[model samples]
Target: ANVRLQVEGLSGQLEKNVRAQLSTIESDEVTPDRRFRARVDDAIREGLKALGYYQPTIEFDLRPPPKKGRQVLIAKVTPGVLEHHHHHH
Candidate 1:
């Protein structure tokens, strides 16, 4: 059985990175609500960091898997506005 991952509220390179991270989720961990929640949260955080967006607001489904063993994970990520830093030598 495979875990289905879906992401919203993001696009371009950010979405691509997030999807890549979520794709690595394990089926065994996704069956349980707690495991799935934690894994999804971590994956999103890492994905955000990879794109230099540390602060983000996210929402997602936190429910137990269906009896048929099919799992669907949906996460909505709101990345904060990018900060412009002045570079000096």
Candidate 2:
């Protein structure tokens, strides 16, 4: 499966990290099965949370590839907000 992630309202390392988290799913050997599809959400959420993004809107589309070709999984992610903690010393 070919996993493509489109992150809106975010960029730089934050975006890079999110893509890194989905590396496994982007591998050539990966199959976009039901189980794998579910994992995509978890992976995206985990990626966002790692960078303090707790609430995010994630949507995806599975496109059929040419005959005997790999399927394309396009994930559109909107990082709502970044949770920040302030420490008063």
Q: Which model scores highest in TM-score?
A: 1
TM-score each candidate: 0.70, 0.65
Off by over 4 Å in 2: 1-9, 26-28, 66-69, 84-89
lDDT (tens digit, per residue) of candidate 2 on 28-75:
566567776667767777877777677567676777663344555666
TM-score of 2: 0.65
Q: Tell me the deviation in Å of residue 4 in model 2.
A: 5.4
lDDT of 1 by residue, 4-64 (tens): 6778866666778888877876644535467666777678778876675785676687434
Candidate 1, residue 21: the lDDT equals: 75
How close to the true structure is residue 56 of candidate 2, measured as C-alpha lDDT?
65
lDDT of 1 at 12: 65
Clashes of 2: 0
